[PDB]
Design an enzyme around this catalytic site. Structure first.
Site, PDB file in Angstrom:
ATOM      1  N   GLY A   1      22.164  68.423  13.049  1.00 55.48           N
ATOM      2  CA  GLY A   1      21.644  68.425  14.407  1.00 55.48           C
ATOM      3  C   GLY A   1      20.460  67.491  14.530  1.00 55.48           C
TER       4      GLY A   1
ATOM      5  N   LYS B   1      21.489  77.690   9.483  1.00 52.65           N
ATOM      6  CA  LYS B   1      20.958  76.630  10.343  1.00 52.65           C
ATOM      7  C   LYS B   1      19.465  76.515  10.117  1.00 52.65           C
ATOM      8  CE  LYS B   1      21.123  75.254  15.146  1.00 52.65           C
ATOM      9  NZ  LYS B   1      21.656  75.961  16.332  1.00 52.65           N
TER      10      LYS B   1
ATOM     11  N   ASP C   1      25.763  73.029  27.626  1.00 53.26           N
ATOM     12  CA  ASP C   1      26.239  72.038  26.649  1.00 53.26           C
ATOM     13  C   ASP C   1      27.615  72.406  26.064  1.00 53.26           C
ATOM     14  OD1 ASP C   1      26.117  69.538  25.266  1.00 53.26           O
ATOM     15  OD2 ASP C   1      25.008  70.433  23.574  1.00 53.26           O
TER      16      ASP C   1
ATOM     17  N   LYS D   1      31.021  71.748  24.798  1.00 51.46           N
ATOM     18  CA  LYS D   1      31.707  70.633  24.141  1.00 51.46           C
ATOM     19  C   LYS D   1      32.511  71.117  22.924  1.00 51.46           C
ATOM     20  CE  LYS D   1      27.503  68.899  21.832  1.00 51.46           C
ATOM     21  NZ  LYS D   1      26.673  67.682  21.632  1.00 51.46           N
TER      22      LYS D   1
ATOM     23  N   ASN E   1      30.697  72.407  19.690  1.00 54.48           N
ATOM     24  CA  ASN E   1      30.112  73.752  19.805  1.00 54.48           C
ATOM     25  C   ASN E   1      31.176  74.861  19.847  1.00 54.48           C
ATOM     26  OD1 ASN E   1      27.563  72.499  19.861  1.00 54.48           O
ATOM     27  ND2 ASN E   1      27.449  72.600  22.097  1.00 54.48           N
TER      28      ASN E   1
ATOM     29  N   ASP F   1      25.800  77.028  18.890  1.00 51.54           N
ATOM     30  CA  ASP F   1      24.719  76.209  19.443  1.00 51.54           C
ATOM     31  C   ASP F   1      24.355  76.612  20.882  1.00 51.54           C
ATOM     32  OD1 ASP F   1      22.714  74.030  19.135  1.00 51.54           O
ATOM     33  OD2 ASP F   1      23.941  73.066  20.694  1.00 51.54           O
TER      34      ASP F   1
ATOM     35  N   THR G   1      25.391  66.743  26.829  1.00 48.06           N
ATOM     36  CA  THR G   1      26.006  65.577  26.184  1.00 48.06           C
ATOM     37  C   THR G   1      26.495  64.554  27.235  1.00 48.06           C
ATOM     38  OG1 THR G   1      26.422  66.997  24.332  1.00 48.06           O
ATOM     39  CG2 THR G   1      27.744  64.985  24.405  1.00 48.06           C
TER      40      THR G   1
HETATM   41  C1  LIG Z   1      28.598  79.070  12.152  1.00 48.05           C
HETATM   42  O1  LIG Z   1      28.414  77.682  11.855  1.00 48.05           O
HETATM   43  C2  LIG Z   1      27.651  76.897  12.672  1.00 48.05           C
HETATM   44  C3  LIG Z   1      26.800  77.472  13.625  1.00 48.05           C
HETATM   45  C4  LIG Z   1      26.027  76.677  14.447  1.00 48.05           C
HETATM   46  C5  LIG Z   1      26.091  75.275  14.347  1.00 48.05           C
HETATM   47  C6  LIG Z   1      25.216  74.445  15.213  1.00 48.05           C
HETATM   48  O2  LIG Z   1      24.485  75.002  16.019  1.00 48.05           O
HETATM   49  N1  LIG Z   1      25.204  73.097  15.065  1.00 48.05           N
HETATM   50  C7  LIG Z   1      24.359  72.181  15.850  1.00 48.05           C
HETATM   51  C8  LIG Z   1      22.974  72.035  15.254  1.00 48.05           C
HETATM   52  C9  LIG Z   1      22.742  72.144  13.881  1.00 48.05           C
HETATM   53  C10 LIG Z   1      21.458  72.007  13.352  1.00 48.05           C
HETATM   54  C11 LIG Z   1      20.385  71.765  14.196  1.00 48.05           C
HETATM   55  C12 LIG Z   1      20.603  71.673  15.585  1.00 48.05           C
HETATM   56  C13 LIG Z   1      19.505  71.337  16.513  1.00 48.05           C
HETATM   57  O3  LIG Z   1      18.651  70.554  16.140  1.00 48.05           O
HETATM   58  N2  LIG Z   1      19.547  71.801  17.784  1.00 48.05           N
HETATM   59  C14 LIG Z   1      18.628  71.481  18.780  1.00 48.05           C
HETATM   60  N3  LIG Z   1      18.678  71.938  19.993  1.00 48.05           N
HETATM   61  C15 LIG Z   1      17.739  71.555  20.844  1.00 48.05           C
HETATM   62  C16 LIG Z   1      16.830  70.722  20.273  1.00 48.05           C
HETATM   63  S1  LIG Z   1      17.289  70.432  18.612  1.00 48.05           S
HETATM   64  C17 LIG Z   1      15.660  70.093  21.003  1.00 48.05           C
HETATM   65  N4  LIG Z   1      16.058  69.913  22.412  1.00 48.05           N
HETATM   66  C18 LIG Z   1      16.714  68.603  22.592  1.00 48.05           C
HETATM   67  C19 LIG Z   1      16.809  70.975  23.104  1.00 48.05           C
HETATM   68  C20 LIG Z   1      17.633  72.002  22.310  1.00 48.05           C
HETATM   69  C21 LIG Z   1      21.910  71.765  16.099  1.00 48.05           C
HETATM   70  C22 LIG Z   1      26.943  74.689  13.383  1.00 48.05           C
HETATM   71  C23 LIG Z   1      27.720  75.493  12.541  1.00 48.05           C
HETATM   72  O4  LIG Z   1      28.566  74.961  11.599  1.00 48.05           O
HETATM   73  C24 LIG Z   1      28.500  73.580  11.218  1.00 48.05           C
END
Ligand SMILES: COc1ccc(C(=O)NCc2cccc(C(=O)Nc3nc4c(s3)CN(C)CC4)c2)cc1OC
Ligand SMILES: COc1ccc(C(=O)NCc2cccc(C(=O)Nc3nc4c(s3)CN(C)CC4)c2)cc1OC
Lengths: 352, 384
Positions: B72, B92, B185, B187, B190, B203, B224
């Site tokens: 992410g 995560k 979001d 997509k 997610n 997410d 996105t």
């Molecule tokens: C059960 O398995 C899983 C469960 C959840 C996810 C998942 O969630 N992935 C997206 C992700 C991963 C790591 C960090 C962030 C992140 O930085 N997410 C962020 N969200 C926001 C941020 S940074 C700052 N802002 C821009 C608004 C909201 C997002 C993946 C999985 O399997 C692969």
């Protein structure tokens, strides 16, 4: 060390009253943080501002639910000290009568030394001895530290010696009670350092209980104004026994052994005790011995009481009490983070 | 009265209170700050005892990292195994440095709560939430079937499969809406699949709670570029008032991409996509050949319109009543109990065949010269 074993071990630390990371002590951390951060200059910091926004109302709700000075109705001031006062209080909800010690956080921060009360807290709360004044509750606000203790209606021994011409039979009783009381303090791993009649209180039955432990200190591994010993003015527990001899002399003579109108005069008299120290033969022998071996002394040999049943026997002066509230035996905004509430985190104790 | 100290949803719960002391020790333990006698003596008293607490409490060291299964903006998702219980999870990680640097260090709250307290087969379950001076950790249930991006890349998705996955997303989003949230979001990245091949939303970092009239006021576009709706895309100061229909737009985008193989508003230039979304009335074109039926095209167009005439505006039942979802294999109330189009072939409890491989590369807070409180926005994150 594998959970749920270390999870149980973690749960014990949150429940234990003797723990510094106890549920009540952890609330103090958040409470102190809210007090020390809630200032317009500090709120300019987005981390401080948003933290305060989240824990705003919830800490105010906590402050309302928790024990406060407003829960107690002050009857009258029964004592005064350097950093506070002792007032006779009645809990508004339970109607239970107590003695509440107040310690000013301002004075503790201004002239430094804000750790003396930690000894007094641990002694009064976890003693479970008939010789120590019981601490029921400990709480605090941004201004004071509060200590809800058992009320001693008999008054202090200074008041007893002023109102009575103390005979040797009475002197034998009160000295013996102090000996047993101090032994309990030593058994807990502490040294009083300020044994005096002002710190010796009497209950409704007329029996002795030690108080004012703000001069105490916890012993290491092996055990290492006139009432002061020459060694204090590295040492063991034998230093408190000097003050017992000072107390016994004053009780029988009516004056302290090293009295002087000039305080510096007393200091020189204590150091010169060999030539400075000027009733019965065995009472004089005990005073000089201090200036089980204490219990074996001829002065304590009597036909009225025994060492193991002394507190159960009738006291020389039993207080005449008319009511449960009888007092006849008593006469800047910070411009940056300062953390004035930090030395007081973990003071809150409730029991049961 | 101590309900505030036992309740897992409470901000003054036992685990949240420990965070306060833990954060305080992290933010005060610096030589410049220790010059203050109040700070010095507080740290002297809570020295070893906070280190003892840190040892007893859940930490990153309790988990054995198998491999990185996701990435992410502010962190990564790694397949982990708890060293003591040997239980397999998806962890995560969120960078406290990145959250403080780029600001916006409050997105994870609703994500923590949705995953922890949804108790829905459509939402990824959060078992534990913990933290150290560097990261926020989210121990979730592992989804071995991977994401729907991987499914669409590995399979030529027919309309029968498309009908199933769209319907699962509809039921999944309706659950999030019932909890009082707009996803913002939606997509295929997610949309994750369990060991059985059924969909679960993940997410919830963009999730926002609706008011009593199902509305949200936001001055900043969220989501996105390919899946964003026109109302959310054009959101700014004064003009950012939208409901749950923005999630339904994304469903139409997802259904189009699933059947066509490309996003409806694709452009090599990102600003080209922006232009295409705003001009959707003349921009939405279906490939000349055609094989994707009349009712599937009807649904895409029903979602890919202006909010005021978009399907879903009068509730989720009008989406469920659409002819596209009419089939002889499943029903709306028993859909998750039926056999999925793709059931993952799993060899072990740590099988990562449905996840691609990821490469490698951190930054840290500078020592403070005065109190900054970098750990303060994260107090209360700890759960279970
Ligand atoms: C059960 O398995 C899983 C469960 C959840 C996810 C998942 O969630 N992935 C997206 C992700 C991963 C790591 C960090 C962030 C992140 O930085 N997410 C962020 N969200 C926001 C941020 S940074 C700052 N802002 C821009 C608004 C909201 C997002 C993946 C999985 O399997 C692969
Ligand atoms: C339940 O019955 C009672 C139990 C205890 C006391 C008692 O304790 N009295 C003395 C006292 C009262 C209030 C404040 C202080 C104080 O400021 N005491 C202080 N001690 C130190 C200070 S300030 C600064 N530092 C130089 C080290 C030692 C002392 C009284 C009682 O009622 C009769």
């Amino acid at each position: 060390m594998s959970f749920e074993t270390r999870f149980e071990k973690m749960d014990n630390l949150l429940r234990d009253p003797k723990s510094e990371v106890n549920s009540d002590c952890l609330l103090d951390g958040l409470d102190a943080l809210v007090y020390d951060l809630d200032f317009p200059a500090l709120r300019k910091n987005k981390n401080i501002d948003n933290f305060l926004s989240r824990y705003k109302d919830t800490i105010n709700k906590i402050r309302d639910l928790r024990m406060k000075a407003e829960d107690y109705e002050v009857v009258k001031v029964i004592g005064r000290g350097a950093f506070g006062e002792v007032q006779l209080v009645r809990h508004k909800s339970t109607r239970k009568v107590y003695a509440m010690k107040l310690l000013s956080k301002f004075e503790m921060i201004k002239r430094s030394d804000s750790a003396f009360f930690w000894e007094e807290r641990d002694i009064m709360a976890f003693a479970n001895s008939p010789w120590v004044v019981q601490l029921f509750y400990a709480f605090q606000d941004d201004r004071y530290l509060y200590m809800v203790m058992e009320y001693m209606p008999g008054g202090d021994l200074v008041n007893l010696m002023s109102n009575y011409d103390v005979p040797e039979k009475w002197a034998r009783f009160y000295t013996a009670e102090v000996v047993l009381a101090l032994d309990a303090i030593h058994s807990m791993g502490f040294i009083h350092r300020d044994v005096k009649p002002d710190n010796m209180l009497l209950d409704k039955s007329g029996h002795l209980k030690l108080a004012d432990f703000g001069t105490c200190m916890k012993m290491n591994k092996e055990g290492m104004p006139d009432y002061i010993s020459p060694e204090v003015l590295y040492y063991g527990r034998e230093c408190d026994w000097w003050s017992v001899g000072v107390f016994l002399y004053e009780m029988l003579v009516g004056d302290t052994p090293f009295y002087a109108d000039s305080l510096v005069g007393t200091y020189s008299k204590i150091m010169n005790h060999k030539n400075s120290l000027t009733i019965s033969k065995e009472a004089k022998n005990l005073i000089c011995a201090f200036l089980e071996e204490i219990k074996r002394h001829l002065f304590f040999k009597n036909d009225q009481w025994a060492w193991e049943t002394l507190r159960d026997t009738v006291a020389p002066v039993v207080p005449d009490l008319s009511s449960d509230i009888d007092t006849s035996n008593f006469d800047p905004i910070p411009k940056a983070f300062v953390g004035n509430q930090l030395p007081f985190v973990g003071f809150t104790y409730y029991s049961n």
